[PDB]
Scaffold this active site. Structure first.
Site, PDB file in Angstrom:
ATOM      1  N   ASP A   8     -28.518 -53.910  -5.619  1.00 53.17           N
ATOM      2  CA  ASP A   8     -28.429 -53.561  -4.213  1.00 53.17           C
ATOM      3  C   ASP A   8     -29.822 -53.221  -3.702  1.00 53.17           C
ATOM      4  OD1 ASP A   8     -27.780 -52.115  -1.641  1.00 53.17           O
ATOM      5  OD2 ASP A   8     -25.743 -52.545  -2.317  1.00 53.17           O
ATOM      6  N   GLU A  10     -23.714 -62.700   9.384  1.00 52.01           N
ATOM      7  CA  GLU A  10     -24.494 -61.773   8.552  1.00 52.01           C
ATOM      8  C   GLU A  10     -23.819 -61.551   7.194  1.00 52.01           C
ATOM      9  OE1 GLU A  10     -25.178 -58.313  11.071  1.00 52.01           O
ATOM     10  OE2 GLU A  10     -26.914 -59.225  12.050  1.00 52.01           O
ATOM     11  N   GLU A  62     -33.343 -61.964  -4.612  1.00 47.46           N
ATOM     12  CA  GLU A  62     -34.371 -62.996  -4.596  1.00 47.46           C
ATOM     13  C   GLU A  62     -35.666 -62.548  -5.271  1.00 47.46           C
ATOM     14  OE1 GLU A  62     -32.126 -62.250  -2.157  1.00 47.46           O
ATOM     15  OE2 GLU A  62     -31.155 -64.178  -2.658  1.00 47.46           O
ATOM     16  N   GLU A  86     -18.948 -58.875  -2.570  1.00 48.52           N
ATOM     17  CA  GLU A  86     -18.266 -58.669  -1.296  1.00 48.52           C
ATOM     18  C   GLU A  86     -19.178 -59.253  -0.227  1.00 48.52           C
ATOM     19  OE1 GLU A  86     -17.004 -54.726   0.493  1.00 48.52           O
ATOM     20  OE2 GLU A  86     -15.398 -56.215   0.712  1.00 48.52           O
ATOM     21  N   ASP A  95     -11.334 -49.169   3.362  1.00 47.80           N
ATOM     22  CA  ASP A  95     -10.600 -50.402   3.621  1.00 47.80           C
ATOM     23  C   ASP A  95      -9.707 -50.699   2.419  1.00 47.80           C
ATOM     24  OD1 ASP A  95      -9.600 -52.918   4.088  1.00 47.80           O
ATOM     25  OD2 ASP A  95     -11.509 -53.751   4.871  1.00 47.80           O
ATOM     26  N   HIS A 110     -11.475 -53.751   7.811  1.00 49.07           N
ATOM     27  CA  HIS A 110     -12.670 -53.476   8.606  1.00 49.07           C
ATOM     28  C   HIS A 110     -13.263 -54.731   9.234  1.00 49.07           C
ATOM     29  CE1 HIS A 110     -15.028 -54.832   5.062  1.00 49.07           C
ATOM     30  NE2 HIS A 110     -15.990 -55.043   5.947  1.00 49.07           N
ATOM     31  N   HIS A 127     -20.676 -47.445   3.639  1.00 51.82           N
ATOM     32  CA  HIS A 127     -19.917 -47.523   2.400  1.00 51.82           C
ATOM     33  C   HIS A 127     -18.589 -46.792   2.505  1.00 51.82           C
ATOM     34  CE1 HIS A 127     -24.058 -48.534   1.025  1.00 51.82           C
ATOM     35  NE2 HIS A 127     -23.351 -49.490   0.448  1.00 51.82           N
ATOM     36  N   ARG A 159      -8.876 -54.384   1.239  1.00 52.71           N
ATOM     37  CA  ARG A 159      -9.979 -55.058   0.552  1.00 52.71           C
ATOM     38  C   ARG A 159     -10.193 -54.474  -0.844  1.00 52.71           C
ATOM     39  NH1 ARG A 159     -14.686 -51.713  -1.025  1.00 52.71           N
ATOM     40  NH2 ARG A 159     -16.195 -53.276  -1.756  1.00 52.71           N
TER      41      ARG A 159
HETATM   42  N1  LIG Z   1     -30.064 -59.882  -0.484  1.00 51.48           N
HETATM   43  C1  LIG Z   1     -29.532 -58.756  -0.960  1.00 51.48           C
HETATM   44  N2  LIG Z   1     -29.903 -58.335  -2.218  1.00 51.48           N
HETATM   45  C2  LIG Z   1     -29.383 -57.171  -2.744  1.00 51.48           C
HETATM   46  N3  LIG Z   1     -28.474 -56.429  -2.027  1.00 51.48           N
HETATM   47  C3  LIG Z   1     -28.088 -56.834  -0.794  1.00 51.48           C
HETATM   48  C4  LIG Z   1     -28.607 -57.999  -0.235  1.00 51.48           C
HETATM   49  N4  LIG Z   1     -28.040 -58.139   0.985  1.00 51.48           N
HETATM   50  C5  LIG Z   1     -27.194 -57.100   1.207  1.00 51.48           C
HETATM   51  N5  LIG Z   1     -27.218 -56.277   0.112  1.00 51.48           N
HETATM   52  C6  LIG Z   1     -26.452 -55.040  -0.135  1.00 51.48           C
HETATM   53  O1  LIG Z   1     -25.097 -55.399  -0.373  1.00 51.48           O
HETATM   54  C7  LIG Z   1     -24.217 -54.331  -0.059  1.00 51.48           C
HETATM   55  C8  LIG Z   1     -22.918 -54.902   0.511  1.00 51.48           C
HETATM   56  S1  LIG Z   1     -21.709 -53.632   0.988  1.00 51.48           S
HETATM   57  C9  LIG Z   1     -20.729 -53.727  -0.545  1.00 51.48           C
HETATM   58  C10 LIG Z   1     -20.502 -52.303  -1.059  1.00 51.48           C
HETATM   59  C11 LIG Z   1     -19.706 -52.048  -2.349  1.00 51.48           C
HETATM   60  N6  LIG Z   1     -19.134 -53.292  -2.884  1.00 51.48           N
HETATM   61  C12 LIG Z   1     -18.686 -50.933  -2.033  1.00 51.48           C
HETATM   62  O2  LIG Z   1     -17.472 -51.159  -2.018  1.00 51.48           O
HETATM   63  O3  LIG Z   1     -19.061 -49.769  -1.772  1.00 51.48           O
HETATM   64  C13 LIG Z   1     -24.993 -53.411   0.884  1.00 51.48           C
HETATM   65  O4  LIG Z   1     -24.965 -52.095   0.378  1.00 51.48           O
HETATM   66  C14 LIG Z   1     -26.407 -53.991   0.974  1.00 51.48           C
HETATM   67  O5  LIG Z   1     -27.409 -53.018   0.798  1.00 51.48           O
END
Ligand SMILES: Nc1ncnc2c1ncn2[C@@H]1O[C@H](CSCC[C@H](N)C(=O)O)[C@@H](O)[C@H]1O
Ligand SMILES: Nc1ncnc2c1ncn2[C@@H]1O[C@H](CSCC[C@H](N)C(=O)O)[C@@H](O)[C@H]1O
Lengths: 314, 314
Positions: free
Chosen positions: B59, B115, B88, B106, B10, B257, B4, B13
C-alpha cells in the site's frame, strides 16, 4: 464541479448573503465591490443587482469561464469583471481600481477555520479595502456544548475493538483524533452553550491566527454521560447593513452544508446537574501538513484533574 | 483516514472477500499471497487465517505503519509482511519471493472503472502471478438499465434555469455531463437490464483498456418517460474458490459504498412497452486530465435517429 451546487442549494447561507446585499441597495449603489472566491458568481450578481458600479470577482478555479457566461446571460458584463487567479498573484485590479468599498467573501470552513480562505480575505482587506470599508460578512462566533451520543460512539469508535474477530484497537486513537463533520440533534445536547471564539474581520490580524488559544465553560443540565463536544459557528454581517443579518450553523436551526463538528471524548464524562466543564481550546496549523488543523483541549469538571485530548482535522 | 472505515463497514463487500478466502482454506494453505492495496490489512488477515505461508501486502499509504501494528496484535507478524510503496516502484518482493500463487485486490472503482487500481493489478499479475495462479476477485460484469427519475432530475438539472431569479442555464450542460454516484430505488427501473461489459482479470491486457467500446440493448416495460440510465457492476471470485462467490452493487440488493452510477439524459425518452433501446458506450481516460473518465453514449429507440450524449466522470 458539484461543490458550487452545494453552496447555492444551501438556502440558509445564500439567503443570508442575498438579504445582506439586496436589502442594502443604499450601501451598494455606485460602489466598487470585490468578491473573493466568486465561484459561479451568485454574490457578484446580487451586488450588481443592488446597484454597484463595479463588481470584481476573483476565483482561482476554471469555474470562472462559465461564470463569465452567466454574468453575460444576466446582462451584467459591463458591471461584473471576473479574474481567474489566486488573490496573492494579482498585480493590479482592473480598470485602474486601487481601493474598493466592500469585500464580500464566503471564507468560513468546517469548524469555521478548517481549510478556510480567512488569510486570503485578510490580505485582500489590507491591500484594497478603503479605510472604513465593509466586509460581508465580518463577524463569526463559535459555540461549543456537550452531547449524549452513545449510539454513534459505539459505532464509530468501539467498532475497532473487534473487526471480523480481529483486534483493530491499534486504530482506535486515530478514530478518536479525527473530529467528525455531521449533524447532531438538539435533544442530544446536555449542557449549556459556551461562546468560545469570536473572529472580527474588521480588526483581526494575520499573525493573530498563527495559534489561537481560547477558553470555554459550560454547565451540565442532566444526570447523564457525555460522549462528545459539539461545535458550530454563527456568522453576522454587522458593519454596513442597515439592520444586522445573521445565520447559524448550529443544531437548533435549519442545517447548512457546514453541519456541526463533533469531538469524541476518549473517556465518557459522568455528569451531574450543575457540574461545570471549563478549559482551553488551542487551534493551529499542523506542522507536517499545513492544510491540516491541530485542535487541543484541556479541561476539568468541577475543578477535577486536567483532562486533555488532541485532535487533528485533516 | 476514514476511507478505510468505509470499506470495512461495507458488509456486502467485506463478507464476499471473507467468504471467498476463509471458505477456501484448502486453496490458501501454505501458499504465497499478494494483497494489492492492503489498507488496514483485513484481507491479509483473512488470507493468513486461511493458512497462507506468506502474505505480502502493498500500500502506498501511510496507513501501513498502523496496519503493521494490527498484524502484530493479531499474532501474524511472521506471516504478513507489508510494504509501503507503489507497486510500480517495488524492485523485488521480500524473502526472495519471485512468484506468488494468489493475488487479492479491491481494485473496483465507481462505475467499476473510475479511479480504479485495475492497471496496477494487471502489472502485479504480469510480474508475479505464477502460471495458473488466482486473482481474487477475477471477474466483473457491468449492467445498465433505464429509470424514471423525474423528481431528482428537476432538482439536479432544471434547478439551473432560475437561481434566485438569475438565469444559470449556461451551467446546465455541465450538470448533465457529470454522472451521479447515488443509490437508485429498484421501483424506478422501467427497462430490462443489459449486461454491457465483462472484465476478466485472468485474460485482459493493459492495452485493451486504453479505449473500451461496448454495446448495450434493453427493453422498455412501461408507458413512461425515461430520464436517466443507471449502471452498476457485479463482481465474482470465479477461478479458485470451490464454489463461486459473488456480490452485486446493483439496486435490487443491499447497498454498497459504490452505490450505483446515474447518467442523466439531455432529453427525456418517451417509452412505450417493448420499445428497444440499443447503442454503444465508449469508455476512455480524459486527454487533458488522466484521472478523469470519458464516457460516450450513442443509441437509438426502435431504430430512430441516433441520440448521442457525452459524460465526464471527474
Ligand atoms: N498504485 C498503488 N500502489 C500501492 N497501493 C495503492 C496504489 N493505488 C492505490 N493504493 C492503495 O490501495 C488501497 C485501496 S483501499 C483497500 C483497503 C483494504 N482492502 C481494506 O479493506 O481496508 C488504498 O489504501 C490505497 O492507498
Ligand atoms: N486563494 C484563493 N484565491 C482565489 N480564489 C480562491 C482562493 N481560495 C479558494 N478560492 C475559490 O473560492 C471559492 C469559494 S466557494 C464560494 C462560491 C460562491 N460564493 C458561490 O456561492 O457559488 C472556490 O470556488 C475556490 O475556487
Amino acid at each position: 464541479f458539484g461543490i458550487h451546487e452545494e453552496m447555492l442549494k444551501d438556502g440558509i447561507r445564500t439567503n443570508a448573503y442575498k438579504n445582506a446585499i439586496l436589502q442594502n441597495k443604499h450601501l451598494f449603489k455606485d460602489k466598487v465591490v470585490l468578491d473573493i472566491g466568486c465561484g459561479t458568481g451568485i454574490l457578484c450578481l446580487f451586488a450588481a443587482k443592488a446597484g454597484a458600479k463595479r463588481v470584481i470577482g476573483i476565483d482561482m478555479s476554471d469555474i470562472i469561464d462559465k461564470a463569465r457566461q452567466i454574468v453575460s446571460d444576466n446582462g451584467y458584463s459591463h458591471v461584473i469583471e471576473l479574474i481567474k487567479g489566486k488573490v496573492e498573484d494579482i498585480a493590479q485590479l482592473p480598470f485602474g481600481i486601487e481601493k474598493v468599498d466592500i469585500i464580500i467573501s464566503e471564507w468560513m470552513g468546517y469548524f469555521l477555520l478548517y481549510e478556510s480562505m480567512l488569510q486570503t480575505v485578510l490580505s485582500a482587506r489590507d491591500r484594497w479595502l478603503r479605510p472604513g470599508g465593509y466586509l460581508f460578512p465580518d463577524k463569526c462566533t463559535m459555540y461549543i456544548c456537550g452531547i449524549e451520543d452513545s449510539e454513534y460512539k459505539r459505532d464509530k469508535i468501539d467498532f475497532w475493538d473487534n473487526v471480523y474477530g480481529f483486534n483493530f484497537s491499534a486504530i482506535k486513537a486515530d478514530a478518536l483524533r479525527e473530529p467528525l463533520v455531521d449533524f447532531v440533534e438538539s435533544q442530544q445536547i446536555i449542557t449549556t452553550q459556551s461562546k468560545f471564539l469570536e473572529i472580527d474581520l474588521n480588526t483581526i490580524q494575520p499573525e493573530d491566527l498563527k495559534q489561537i488559544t481560547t477558553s470555554f465553560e459550560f454547565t451540565s443540565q442532566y444526570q447523564e454521560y457525555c460522549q462528545a463536544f459539539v461545535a458550530w459557528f454563527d456568522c453576522v454581517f454587522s458593519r454596513g447593513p442597515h439592520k444586522p443579518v445573521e445565520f447559524s450553523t448550529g443544531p437548533f436551526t435549519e442545517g447548512t452544508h457546514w453541519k456541526q463538528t463533533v469531538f469524541y471524548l476518549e473517556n465518557d464524562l459522568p455528569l451531574k446537574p450543575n457540574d461545570v466543564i471549563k478549559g482551553t481550546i488551542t487551534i493551529s496549523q499542523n506542522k507536517s501538513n499545513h492544510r491540516d488543523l491541530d485542535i487541543s483541549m484541556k479541561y476539568t469538571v468541577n475543578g477535577g484533574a486536567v483532562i486533555s485530548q488532541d485532535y487533528i482535522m485533516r
